[PDB]
Design an enzyme around this catalytic site. Structure first.
Site, short mmCIF file in Angstrom:
data_model
loop_
_atom_site.label_atom_id
_atom_site.label_comp_id
_atom_site.label_asym_id
_atom_site.label_seq_id
_atom_site.Cartn_x
_atom_site.Cartn_y
_atom_site.Cartn_z
N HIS A 1 -59.30 -80.55 -26.49
CA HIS A 1 -60.19 -80.61 -27.57
C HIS A 1 -60.27 -79.02 -28.09
O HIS A 1 -59.40 -78.31 -27.51
CB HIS A 1 -61.72 -80.95 -27.14
CG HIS A 1 -62.24 -79.73 -25.69
ND1 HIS A 1 -61.84 -80.22 -24.61
CD2 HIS A 1 -62.81 -78.65 -26.02
CE1 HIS A 1 -62.33 -79.28 -23.71
NE2 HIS A 1 -62.89 -78.27 -24.83
N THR B 1 -67.29 -74.35 -20.95
CA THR B 1 -68.00 -74.03 -21.90
C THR B 1 -69.03 -74.77 -22.68
O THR B 1 -69.84 -74.39 -23.52
CB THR B 1 -67.16 -73.20 -22.88
OG1 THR B 1 -66.57 -74.19 -23.55
CG2 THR B 1 -66.09 -72.21 -22.28
N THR B 2 -69.13 -76.10 -21.96
CA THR B 2 -70.27 -77.06 -22.57
C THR B 2 -71.00 -77.64 -21.59
O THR B 2 -70.33 -77.64 -20.48
CB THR B 2 -69.74 -78.21 -23.49
OG1 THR B 2 -68.80 -78.94 -22.64
CG2 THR B 2 -68.69 -77.65 -24.61
N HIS C 1 -62.71 -76.09 -30.41
CA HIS C 1 -63.81 -75.55 -30.83
C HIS C 1 -63.47 -74.92 -32.12
O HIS C 1 -62.54 -74.01 -32.24
CB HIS C 1 -64.34 -74.42 -29.73
CG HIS C 1 -64.64 -75.14 -28.35
ND1 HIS C 1 -65.86 -75.76 -28.19
CD2 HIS C 1 -63.77 -75.25 -27.16
CE1 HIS C 1 -66.00 -75.95 -27.04
NE2 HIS C 1 -64.78 -75.92 -26.31
N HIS D 1 -70.22 -83.80 -30.37
CA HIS D 1 -69.95 -82.44 -30.16
C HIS D 1 -68.73 -81.82 -30.69
O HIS D 1 -68.71 -80.96 -31.33
CB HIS D 1 -70.31 -82.09 -28.67
CG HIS D 1 -71.45 -82.79 -28.06
ND1 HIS D 1 -72.94 -82.20 -28.35
CD2 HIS D 1 -71.76 -83.71 -27.06
CE1 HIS D 1 -73.88 -83.05 -27.83
NE2 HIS D 1 -73.00 -83.99 -26.98
N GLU E 1 -64.07 -69.25 -28.69
CA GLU E 1 -64.94 -68.87 -27.47
C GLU E 1 -64.88 -67.70 -26.84
O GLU E 1 -65.51 -66.87 -26.77
CB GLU E 1 -64.99 -70.24 -26.67
CG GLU E 1 -65.29 -71.44 -27.37
CD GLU E 1 -66.12 -72.60 -26.47
OE1 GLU E 1 -65.53 -72.87 -25.44
OE2 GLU E 1 -67.18 -72.86 -26.79
N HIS F 1 -58.47 -76.08 -25.95
CA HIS F 1 -58.62 -76.44 -24.66
C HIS F 1 -57.90 -77.43 -24.06
O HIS F 1 -58.17 -78.51 -24.42
CB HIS F 1 -60.19 -76.22 -24.19
CG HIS F 1 -60.82 -75.02 -24.40
ND1 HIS F 1 -62.27 -75.16 -24.66
CD2 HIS F 1 -60.66 -73.69 -24.61
CE1 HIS F 1 -62.84 -73.82 -24.76
NE2 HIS F 1 -61.64 -72.97 -24.71
ZN ZN Z 1 -63.65 -76.44 -24.48
#
Ligand code: ZN
Ligand code: HG
EC number: 4.2.1.1
Length: 258
Positions: A92, A196-197, A94, A62, A104, A117
């Site tokens: 991590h 958010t995941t 995004h 992901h 995000e 994040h």
């Molecule tokens: Zn994140």
């Protein structure tokens, strides 16, 4: 089968396996700078990363996570809107397929190229697994990335990506200093939200920094070369691994500045 960011398993399908997707405090959200409440009682953020110990980097199908040793208060976050100390467990990113999308959270509907994040858990709860059972169990520091000049402190990460190209691969990633990814100012917006995941747990106190950091186009390009698929499977480039803005509902965004 399982969750992803595609047409058949993307953010709009998540609710089927994770009903909380339609909950009361989901993230990300759009930050309306004119509606955010300036709060004078918000203390300055305290980031103590001088003793940080990175261990590994891993592609989980992901995104990629850089993991830290959180068995002691080596890299912690306190101050700001937080009560207590929070330990850095991992960070991590995004990102998008193009420079105009990837973050995000959005600021007045504006999307950045990527979003970093830095995940922390409340030491009060003993471990991460117990922290995710509490409304104040986590604190995530969100930093926007925009395309411009190269970020020296991000190069070490960029260089190692070749070794974890596919889903499931990991590489030793020691002695990495996360302080090299912090912008100059620590001004921020804060609100209560979720991861958010999936599992999309509503246990997060979001601290989104106002000032983004700049990375080069070449640095972001490296991100886009990663794969969602496992070795030997048809190639699916890891791009656009971000969730769209969710309704704010009964929540207020507070700013630490005017
Ligand atoms: Zn994140
Ligand atoms: Hg929770």
């Amino acid at each position: 089968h399982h969750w992803g960011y595609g047409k058949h398993n993307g953010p709009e399908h998540w609710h089927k396996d994770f009903p909380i997707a339609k909950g009361e405090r989901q993230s990300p959200v759009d930050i309306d700078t004119h509606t955010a409440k300036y709060d004078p009682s918000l203390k300055p953020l305290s980031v103590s990363y001088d003793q940080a110990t990175s261990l590994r980097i891993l592609n989980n199908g992901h995104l990629f996570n850089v993991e830290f040793d959180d068995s002691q208060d080596k890299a912690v976050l306190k101050g700001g809107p937080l009560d207590g100390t929070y330990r850095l467990i991992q960070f991590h990113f995004h990102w998008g397929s193009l420079d105009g999308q990837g973050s995000e959270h959005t600021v007045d509907k504006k999307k950045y190229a990527a979003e970093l994040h830095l995940v922390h858990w409340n030491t009060k709860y003993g471990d991460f697994g117990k922290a995710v059972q509490q409304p104040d169990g986590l604190a995530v520091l969100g930093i926007f990335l925009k395309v411009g000049s190269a970020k020296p402190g991000l190069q070490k990460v960029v260089d190692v990506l070749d070794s974890i190209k596919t889903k499931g691969k990991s590489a030793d990633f020691t002695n990495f200093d996360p302080r090299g990814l912090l912008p100059e100012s620590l001004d921020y917006w804060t609100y209560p939200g979720s991861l958010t995941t999936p599992p999309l747990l509503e246990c997060v106190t979001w601290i989104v920094l106002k000032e983004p950091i700049s990375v080069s186009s070449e640095q972001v390009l490296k991100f886009r070369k990663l794969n969602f698929n496992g070795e030997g499977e048809p190639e699916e480039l890891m791009v656009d691994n971000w969730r769209p803005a969710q309704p704010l509902k009964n929540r207020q965004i507070k700013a630490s500045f005017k």
